Amino acid sequence: RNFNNLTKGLCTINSWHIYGKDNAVRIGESSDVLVTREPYVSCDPDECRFYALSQGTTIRGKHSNGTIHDRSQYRALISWPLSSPPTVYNSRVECIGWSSTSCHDGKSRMSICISGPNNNASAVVWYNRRPVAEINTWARNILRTQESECVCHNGVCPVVFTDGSATGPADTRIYYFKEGKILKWESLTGTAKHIEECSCYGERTGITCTCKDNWQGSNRPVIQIDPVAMTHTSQYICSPVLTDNPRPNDPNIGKCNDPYPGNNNNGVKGFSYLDGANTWLGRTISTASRSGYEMLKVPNALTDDRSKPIQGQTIVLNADWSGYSGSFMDYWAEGDCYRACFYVELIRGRPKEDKVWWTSNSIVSMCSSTEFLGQWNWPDGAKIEYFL
Amino acid sequence: RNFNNLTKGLCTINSWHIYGKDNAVRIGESSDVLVTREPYVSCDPDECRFYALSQGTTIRGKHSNGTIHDRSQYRALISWPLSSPPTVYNSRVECIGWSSTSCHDGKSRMSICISGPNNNASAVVWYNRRPVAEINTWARNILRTQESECVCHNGVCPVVFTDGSATGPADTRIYYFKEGKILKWESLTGTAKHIEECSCYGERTGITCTCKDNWQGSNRPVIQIDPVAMTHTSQYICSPVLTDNPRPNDPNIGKCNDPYPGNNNNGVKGFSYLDGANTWLGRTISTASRSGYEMLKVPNALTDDRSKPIQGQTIVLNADWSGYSGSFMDYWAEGDCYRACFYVELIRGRPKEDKVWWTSNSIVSMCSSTEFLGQWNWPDGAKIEYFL
Amino acid sequence: RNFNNLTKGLCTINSWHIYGKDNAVRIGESSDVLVTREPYVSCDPDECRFYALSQGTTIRGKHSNGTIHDRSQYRALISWPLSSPPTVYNSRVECIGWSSTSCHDGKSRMSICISGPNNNASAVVWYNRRPVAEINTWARNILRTQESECVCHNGVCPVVFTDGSATGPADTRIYYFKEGKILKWESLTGTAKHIEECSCYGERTGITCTCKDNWQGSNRPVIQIDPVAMTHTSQYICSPVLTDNPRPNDPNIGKCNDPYPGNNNNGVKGFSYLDGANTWLGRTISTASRSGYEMLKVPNALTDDRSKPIQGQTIVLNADWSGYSGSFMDYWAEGDCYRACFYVELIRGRPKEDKVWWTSNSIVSMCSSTEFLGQWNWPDGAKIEYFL
Amino acid sequence: RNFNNLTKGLCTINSWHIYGKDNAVRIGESSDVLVTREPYVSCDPDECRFYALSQGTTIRGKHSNGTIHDRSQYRALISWPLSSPPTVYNSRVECIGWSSTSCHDGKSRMSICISGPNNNASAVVWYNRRPVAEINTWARNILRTQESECVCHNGVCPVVFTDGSATGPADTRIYYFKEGKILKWESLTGTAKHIEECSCYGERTGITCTCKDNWQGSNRPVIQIDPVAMTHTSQYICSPVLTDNPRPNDPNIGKCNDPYPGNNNNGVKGFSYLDGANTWLGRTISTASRSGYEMLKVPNALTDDRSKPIQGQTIVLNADWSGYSGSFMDYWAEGDCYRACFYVELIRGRPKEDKVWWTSNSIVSMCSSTEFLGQWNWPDGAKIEYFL
Ligand SMILES: *[C@@H]1O[C@H](CO)[C@@H](O[C@@H]2O[C@H](CO)[C@@H](O[C@@H]3O[C@H](CO[C@H]4O[C@H](CO[C@H]5O[C@H](CO)[C@@H](O)[C@H](O)[C@@H]5O)[C@@H](O)[C@H](O[C@H]5O[C@H](CO)[C@@H](O)[C@H](O)[C@@H]5O)[C@@H]4O)[C@@H](O)[C@H](O[C@H]4O[C@H](CO)[C@@H](O)[C@H](O)[C@@H]4O[C@H]4O[C@H](CO)[C@@H](O)[C@H](O)[C@@H]4O[C@H]4O[C@H](CO)[C@@H](O)[C@H](O)[C@@H]4O)[C@@H]3O)[C@H](O)[C@H]2NC(C)=O)[C@H](O)[C@H]1NC(C)=O
Ligand SMILES: *[C@@H]1O[C@H](CO)[C@@H](O[C@@H]2O[C@H](CO)[C@@H](O[C@@H]3O[C@H](CO[C@H]4O[C@H](CO[C@H]5O[C@H](CO)[C@@H](O)[C@H](O)[C@@H]5O)[C@@H](O)[C@H](O[C@H]5O[C@H](CO)[C@@H](O)[C@H](O)[C@@H]5O)[C@@H]4O)[C@@H](O)[C@H](O[C@H]4O[C@H](CO)[C@@H](O)[C@H](O)[C@@H]4O[C@H]4O[C@H](CO)[C@@H](O)[C@H](O)[C@@H]4O[C@H]4O[C@H](CO)[C@@H](O)[C@H](O)[C@@H]4O)[C@@H]3O)[C@H](O)[C@H]2NC(C)=O)[C@H](O)[C@H]1NC(C)=O
Ligand SMILES: *[C@@H]1O[C@H](CO)[C@@H](O[C@@H]2O[C@H](CO)[C@@H](O[C@@H]3O[C@H](CO[C@H]4O[C@H](CO[C@H]5O[C@H](CO)[C@@H](O)[C@H](O)[C@@H]5O)[C@@H](O)[C@H](O[C@H]5O[C@H](CO)[C@@H](O)[C@H](O)[C@@H]5O)[C@@H]4O)[C@@H](O)[C@H](O[C@H]4O[C@H](CO)[C@@H](O)[C@H](O)[C@@H]4O[C@H]4O[C@H](CO)[C@@H](O)[C@H](O)[C@@H]4O[C@H]4O[C@H](CO)[C@@H](O)[C@H](O)[C@@H]4O)[C@@H]3O)[C@H](O)[C@H]2NC(C)=O)[C@H](O)[C@H]1NC(C)=O
Ligand SMILES: *[C@@H]1O[C@H](CO)[C@@H](O[C@@H]2O[C@H](CO)[C@@H](O[C@@H]3O[C@H](CO[C@H]4O[C@H](CO[C@H]5O[C@H](CO)[C@@H](O)[C@H](O)[C@@H]5O)[C@@H](O)[C@H](O[C@H]5O[C@H](CO)[C@@H](O)[C@H](O)[C@@H]5O)[C@@H]4O)[C@@H](O)[C@H](O[C@H]4O[C@H](CO)[C@@H](O)[C@H](O)[C@@H]4O[C@H]4O[C@H](CO)[C@@H](O)[C@H](O)[C@@H]4O[C@H]4O[C@H](CO)[C@@H](O)[C@H](O)[C@@H]4O)[C@@H]3O)[C@H](O)[C@H]2NC(C)=O)[C@H](O)[C@H]1NC(C)=O
């Protein structure tokens, strides 16, 4: 086995096709399905799997009561076979904690889980299913990381962490790991003013992360990482097509180097693929809440502060609940290009549906096609009333 | 690993022996068994498995209500170990959608799932568990495919698709795939006037598909495919032993090149083995509904419009519900001939049993023997009243 | 991989140690455990597993009602990991039917399942998980076989079948298989007057089967098979220590060549290890019913019509239900001798416990030790009242 | 594969990080989780797993009633994937019995289970999943062993057994196994006056076991084993930081060669890492009951009868139930040192929580870090009232 290198460009994205869907909430109405949130997808050279943070209880279990709570001792990063639901009997625990990332380097997988109280959290870095390195909180305020997969190049896997306020300046660091060991870390540089929950992907040009500014911005900050030099830059998506949630309406001039104003102290994890004319942005349809999901083709969105959509695709109707979204790719697929993929977390229960006492989600996932495929919509599909 | 070639003829069929049975509805009365329909069987070089379209809920789950519905976003092609039932915990998702086919080429498996609304459906072709190619609807009217396994020769795997009306002329295409990539496609030629849900098998003479004419015919159309030249012909089974359902009574002269009349806009997926004097046809016992199942030895059924049975075997009593049936073979078995096999879908619930609000099925499967074996009958075996 | 040869003698048996126990009925009170009966144990070169005939329902499932019934279409031979219970989610179906045997030859496993109505039953012989050969009923009266493992030598695996009356002379055949193919079969010869449900083991001297005479005898018939010459002899255990159930009290002179009288048209599957001074017999403690189980060291029991016990070990107290028992050995274990093993089926439910409507069992299993180990007793352990 | 040799020293322990946690009781409120107690953790060269003694019933099962009982015929040593809970469907049975140990030698795993009545118990030694050797009770009074992993060096795996009184002098033996075979055994020598439930680990200096004196001592006895010479010594931890439970308050002078007095006929399994200035002791926080858990850095605790803590870490709050604790290490990890690990059994139910009729546990586990990591606390997390 050799370390994977990012030698390909993105495939041309002309539409999106269904990749995976687990229908976890539907099935968990009458099966031993774990309560989760913060899901993602990540590939090994021989298999792609769903990932999420378990809450250490099933949905029908009485301990599902109170699972809106983010950071208990009963959480763990689990993985399970593609499009199966996360069950007690098929879920593999990768590490223990309430914030995570994970990625395969071509030889083995690195998984990182953070646990602890708000003022004393720590990250444990696992490699090849063994703990290798640990990182203590540096700002004593909820050390946290991506909640989707990291990306590796020739054994080097960069990860973005934040420690500090969610409603003001915080201390963001980019760590560079190899075989679980810390090669280097850097403080955040560039014009991004607040960074959380980065969604990353890699291609020949380097590693691109689309993150969330929770403090002031409804445009998304972007971190661009060179995994060879182990250096990075940051800014915002220049486009006036704003992609955080909640957010103001789309203006005609975006902001490249500062938060676009209107909504403070809020946001959702999201993603984009930034690739010149081949650029596609994901966002919730609603500007007010986590409902609906759509992809928009916005040429040069990263660098053009006037850029508007020229094509799109609805993924989830506005009538249906969405949630977190993030990027991943099968870096070990055949062919001459990397096929862009993403998942959308479909949150059910609290706070929006409070007849039940739990919060969970299911997953839908798409990858790009060079065809111009017809579109459908992909709801969670569970009837909340069945759980009453 | 090498691509499989179809180098053998069919084994002489003198009777049928039990191959597999999952008793899924019996077991699912008190286990986490997924609601399914449209099942089949398909072999890898090292394992044979059951396949079906899940409905994304268990039978005892409240979401089983309404599963007579064919095309929801909650369906997926799943596979599971031979004769086990399709459970939440043992089912492997092959792809997402509501119409499918799947086959192994000797090196890896190709699976195809179609999803979307009626006017905007698309097929995604997976190879070696990765998406490779996509096909958009060409007639904007429920793009659909075999619902049983495809067959490969030297890496080339033909698949029959239909897009268009189920009650009039439609647009049928034969696609030729290799490693998931589209080599070629052709429009339907020959005398078959309507094609749906082809059941296929391969042998030295080529690939033979027995399909369903949903429009006018109660005889079954046949497509014969040369996977080397990538060409095909079509006609109907000439025999007056009619094998669709519902159907008229058997006449003494069948039809080779046109639908045999009596029943319009209806039918069921079925199969046959067409091999000269070694020819066997499957059919429901009832001419009116999907009940019972029998095999009939009808010499030269394909080409002889006077041909009648000279031997038979009851598989399911007329008193018991049947459903879809299709062909498969273990192409990787030892010996000098390919042993013909088939499955029968045993549908339970709606529309025939409407005290329950669900529709599901179990599977029974047989393969041929050169012995003249005693016959039994093989009902689903569940008591519907237990579910009330 | 090479075919296994029987090159070793039996280890000296000085006591019996616990080998496996699944507690299936206890666990199945609140888990998806399949209803079974007729269990056994059999080893592969890399794993040993529990086997049994499923009834195609769980114990808590409503379809458990009526499972005293022996021969439904819903039965299958399943295998599952040693000492785990037979669950819906961990059980592997070997073949479909209501009477079975199975054994590994060193390269692959042969499994045989019989199905059909009483007058038209057939055996299907599977090898390396594929059907290879089939055998039609020859007496049209419940074709049936061992219900425990067969034994192989240099690829040749003999199996004992019976077709015909259970209450009079029947037609017993010994079949000799290699890679699932029929090499040869012989009609029963020797002085055994009725043969059912043979329990077999192999060692350098050949293959020894201890069976059940259901017609007239309460001593057990024995078949001795030479797997090289493919020939056999038969007689009864000469010892007056009678080992069938029900049975008369032990006399002081046994019978070598005829049924010992007292109980007609009844019996239970059992076993023995016949090895000169190293001879041990298994039996129920009760002479009237299937309760208790004990092993008795009876020197030269096979050939000495005066032989009595000189040592023993209680396995199951008379107060607890037992049932079928049979032999197996790990032929792939390290060392210079084959360690004798056996299982006892612990039947719960009907007919003896009729407050419940089901019949099932759990398994306990022992192997021999060269130590003189202390003895315990090994009940099923379920409380029947919990199921009411 | 080669036998593992203990060639490394312990990593410097500056804090403890979360390693694993299964949340078994939470999940088992609504899943098929087996009732357990006496858990531990042990690594293979390619995987680390949780181990425990099942009670042969699930928690929600009616047979959970009475599981405070220690030694039934329904117990077995099971193992299951790291941080998953012990379920009916994912648990692998290693052997049958009510007291156990297990360890991998680099080539294969040895597991030992003891079963029987109090006066006639026996150990069966399994190697590479086969029974190899057996040991009969020598004192006829509950033959028993470690309840956590053993340790191997160049194929030699020492195990500590005790047979005899729990409230007076007993007969302790150290056995030395290789490939499951008994190389040698010795009677206990040294100044330890009573030995139970040893927790062991290995490093270049040899094998160190921290045990429980159930008779008179609230300091812990220590056995130090040379696996090459196959010899041992024993004493107590000299430190006045007392680590049994229940126990007196900490004095200023401990005892090196005799039980520290105050509490008779009681105790709990525990552990320590004894490594000069790198020494850490585990203990319950409460002196009266099995509640809370803490690690204390006590330099030269083994040899210094005045030694006090200079650093510590809370693992479980005093408000939460703890239980057994023991040592293990991943001997096959990369790097230049062995990373010290431990687990704590979190007992729920009887006797402390008698509203329920069962006794079970969950597991939390930590390994050492060279960082000074922030601390959290790790409760079982189940709400007992949910089970009423
Ligand atoms: C079968 O499936 C297929 C495949 O999916 C279906 O075909 C798809 O249909 C969908 C729906 O129509 C399309 O998505 C929309 O795409 C448009 C972009 O394409 C249009 O505009 C292009 C750009 O034109 C401009 O520039 C060009 C330069 O070339 C110039 O020529 C032109 O004059 C103009 O200046 C056109 O090029 C394009 O034409 C082409 O395509 C046509 C087919 O689409 C074809 O007919 C033409 O011949 C030509 O080939 C086309 O006109 C997106 O703009 C749109 O997204 C907006 O609207 C949706 C609602 O539908 C909304 O949710 C989006 O967020 C977005 O609108 C918001 O944001 C805007 C940007 O800021 C803003 O301006 C809006 O006011 C709006 O903002 C409000 O809402 C948001 C969200 O809540 C909020 O945040 C704001 O604050 C504010 O409140 C859709 O993505 C697919 O592209 C199309 N795919 C294909 C391959 O055709 C087909 O329909 C299915 N068949 C059936 C029968 O069902
Ligand atoms: C133990 O198990 C064994 C093995 O399973 C059992 O043995 C089996 O028994 C079954 C049941 O009898 C047999 O199945 C039937 O087979 C017959 C065909 O064989 C008969 O006819 C042959 C052809 O004869 C003609 O041509 C020959 C040329 O050689 C000529 O010689 C002859 O005069 C005549 O012209 C004969 O060769 C054959 O004889 C041989 O076999 C005999 C044993 O079977 C033996 O005794 C002889 O010595 C000789 O060796 C034999 O006579 C099928 O015709 C039949 O299928 C029809 O009937 C069933 C109902 O049973 C029906 O469901 C079928 O659909 C079909 O009938 C419908 O279709 C016909 C064709 O259009 C039509 O003509 C009918 O009117 C009818 O149509 C109506 O119903 C359908 C369906 O609902 C509907 O669609 C229509 O519209 C309409 O309403 C059976 O398949 C097995 O072959 C046999 N197997 C073996 C190896 O023997 C055994 O019984 C078991 N033992 C016990 C104790 O239980
Ligand atoms: C800790 O665990 C250990 C290890 O398990 C326990 O030790 C074990 O204890 C058990 C129970 O006692 C023993 O099992 C019994 O073994 C005897 C056989 O051994 C006795 O007899 C031997 C033969 O003696 C004869 O020949 C010799 C020739 O050498 C001659 O010297 C002698 O005079 C006589 O002629 C003796 O050699 C042997 O002595 C040796 O062992 C002694 C210890 O056992 C020791 O003290 C001596 O010093 C010496 O070393 C010993 O005396 C079996 O006969 C017996 O089985 C019968 O009884 C049980 C009931 O207990 C019954 O279920 C059996 O079926 C059987 O009895 C039925 O069948 C008979 C044969 O037909 C018949 O004669 C009976 O009337 C009876 O028939 C009735 O019931 C049956 C069944 O329902 C029915 O079918 C009939 O129709 C009828 O109704 C036991 O198997 C173990 O051998 C022993 N193991 C060891 C290693 O010691 C220990 O107890 C445990 N410790 C504690 C504290 O619990
Ligand atoms: C974020 O997380 C971090 C990392 O976890 C947190 O930092 C940790 O904080 C905890 C809690 O405070 C610390 O654990 C305690 O450690 C002390 C030992 O360290 C103290 O003492 C050291 C020794 O000093 C002595 O010798 C030195 C020689 O150098 C000499 O200089 C000195 O004068 C004195 O003679 C000091 O070196 C050490 O100072 C260092 O560290 C300080 C930070 O801790 C720092 O500020 C200093 O600058 C310096 O660097 C420090 O003073 C343990 O003693 C203590 O354990 C005792 O207390 C707990 C209760 O808290 C109890 O449960 C323990 O069992 C134990 O006390 C019992 O046993 C004693 C021994 O017999 C006995 O004397 C006691 O009376 C008591 O006995 C009673 O209870 C027991 C149990 O029920 C019963 O059995 C008895 O019978 C009786 O009833 C703690 O383990 C960590 O070390 C510390 N870690 C780090 C890296 O700093 C941080 O707090 C978190 N942040 C936030 C905001 O939450």
Ligand SMILES: CCC(CC)O[C@@H]1C=C(C(=O)O)C[C@H](N)[C@H]1NC(C)=O
């Ligand atoms: C703690 C900062 C951050 C922003 C408020 O919280 C998050 C928001 C989330 C959300 O907006 O859905 C859920 C997260 N799991 C969470 N992260 C952690 C570590 O708790």
Ligand SMILES: CCC(CC)O[C@@H]1C=C(C(=O)O)C[C@H](N)[C@H]1NC(C)=O
């Ligand atoms: C849509 C045409 C066709 C004929 C009416 O429908 C089918 C009939 C079926 C049936 O007759 O049982 C069930 C099928 N799953 C279905 N195919 C799809 C794609 O919905």
Ligand SMILES: CCC(CC)O[C@@H]1C=C(C(=O)O)C[C@H](N)[C@H]1NC(C)=O
């Ligand atoms: C039998 C002596 C010993 C000390 C009283 O008992 C133990 C105490 C235990 C306890 O204190 O929790 C539980 C154990 N599983 C047990 N060991 C056996 C073999 O029963």
Ligand SMILES: [Ca+2]
């Ligand atoms: Ca924001």
Ligand SMILES: [Ca+2]
């Ligand atoms: Ca038709």
Ligand SMILES: [Ca+2]
């Ligand atoms: Ca008898």
Ligand SMILES: [Ca+2]
């Ligand atoms: Ca003590």
